[PDB]
From a paper:
Here, we report the deposition of 14 structures of enzymes from both the core and accessory genomes of sequence type 23 (ST23) K1 hypervirulent [name]. Targets were selected using a shotgun approach aimed at uncharacterized metabolic proteins from ST23 K1 hypervirulent [name]. In silico multilocus sequence typing of all [name] isolates was completed using Kleborate.
In all, structures represent both metabolic proteins and possible transcriptional regulators.
Residue numbers in the entry:
A (entry chain A): 59 to 331
B (entry chain B): 61 to 331
Write the structure that this text describes.
């Protein structure tokens, strides 16, 4: 008789090994309750029905489907009947318990802090439009601007194209809003810290100072950087750790609800504003 | 079916080297084997964690560190691992697969000097970290083969802890007199040091690489191609390390040698 076990299916840890804080959080939470936990990673060359059968081989008591990058889970509808809970992803067809970041609250607290600090004309650089978080973050940004008496439709907005090759388009977008060395914005709201990286390199290389000449705000607090920005980047923490914890407890305490719970995305003010 | 038990000692503090455990899991399935991973956190303790992976009763065991270290665990706990990935055993001799830090730094510095640079500022990682001294042998050999005595160059060692990455800007500006730098290039211990270097040089009004070439190390999956211009670096072979470690168990090897895995030079546009 082995202890209770949580089976986890990671759909894309291969292309984005940053959200590993989700699977680590699950493993740590399960151990703090006398449970075990294994993780099956889905690569590109293998295929779903095989991978799902493999995690069923360990015969788990509960199952968690997770995406390292907030997505909508592109798997057969017949394979979305096994997962007791979804971590950082939502099911379009069947309704399943889901724990996702509160993208609208995160972007709102960030933009609210920026405007409150005195900025009024931010350049807004959004992530790909179809990504599920992009539209929720923009609602937060818009709500913060309207509460400050600013119509967000009057600001400069830009959407990135899908793929890391597009991070190199950011510099051209920033320089396009700079006329004869003086910028047509007093701040820059970045879809993520990788966009902030591009922004820092472009502004410093243009002879501008952060934040004396231009404030900057990122999103994610990427475990790989965040504190490496000069100056330290004001950003928003993606709650990968709380997402994994809440997902594990849902199974540990055998919950039956199938609601989509939005986890708090805390604002990390630093020195970029 | 046969199963490989993996013990990750520090994926909590450095979740970048996850490419090792992923590579192990992928290689084991390509041979009809299974594989589980036990992560050691800070709040738990070894004897408990080691007993836990023995619970799954594995056919082979791999001890791995996300950051090349010398494995700070009881000598009696280093008798179970069939192979060590990205780490070495000081006491008992155990089969180990580690990066060829000397070859990696050599190919990098060789390419830099060959491109025409002669006075690089060398920013090394903490001295006690086992790779730091091996990378410096590579750097020195490249410089001596180019007729340069590395003892005449400016060297600096970082202090242990991420808090010290913020000391890099001061070290770079200390080698700049009245706006003109006293170096024509910068050899960085890793891409995180390169990040600090880029921010400091661009903020100083210097151009990369027209005024100062820059070279990193690791090719951090999280950046590398995000540098402006794209950072010339060295790839840490986490993927090959995991693969070779899995095969050692799959094919039941008996040697207890320390194999150095190739660390390939990724030239880009920072030089």
């Amino acid at each position: 008789a082995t202890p209770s076990t949580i089976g986890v299916l990671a759909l894309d840890t291969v292309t984005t090994p940053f959200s590993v804080e989700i699977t680590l959080s699950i493993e740590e939470t399960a151990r703090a309750h006398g449970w075990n936990s294994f993780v099956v990673n889905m690569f590109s060359d293998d295929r779903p029905e095989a991978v799902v059968d493999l995690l069923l081989s360990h015969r788990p008591d509960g199952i968690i489907f997770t995406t390292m990058g907030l997505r909508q889970v592109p798997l057969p509808e017949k394979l979305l009947t096994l997962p007791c809970v979804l971590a950082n992803c939502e099911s379009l067809s069947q309704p399943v318990a889901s724990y996702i970041p509160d993208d609208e609250q995160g972007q709102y607290d960030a933009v609210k802090a920026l405007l409150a600090a005195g900025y009024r004309r931010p350049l807004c650089l959004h992530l790909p439009a179809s990504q599920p978080a992009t539209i929720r973050r923009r609602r937060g940004l818009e709500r913060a601007c309207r509460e400050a008496g600013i119509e967000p439709d009057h600001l400069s907005h830009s959407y990135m194209g899908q793929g890391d090759e597009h991070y190199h388009d950011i510099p051209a977008v920033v320089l396009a809003h700079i006329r004869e060395g003086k910028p047509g914005f007093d701040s820059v709201i970045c879809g993520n810290d990788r966009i902030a990286f591009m922004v820092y390199q472009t502004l410093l290389g243009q002879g501008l100072r952060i934040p004396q000449d231009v404030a900057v705000v990122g999103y994610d607090n990427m475990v790989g950087i965040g504190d490496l920005f000069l100056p330290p980047l004001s950003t928003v923490q993606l709650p990968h750790y709380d997402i994994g914890r809440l997902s594990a407890l849902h199974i540990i305490h055998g919950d039956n609800h199938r609601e989509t719970r939005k986890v708090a995305s805390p604002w990390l003010p630093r020195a970029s504003h």
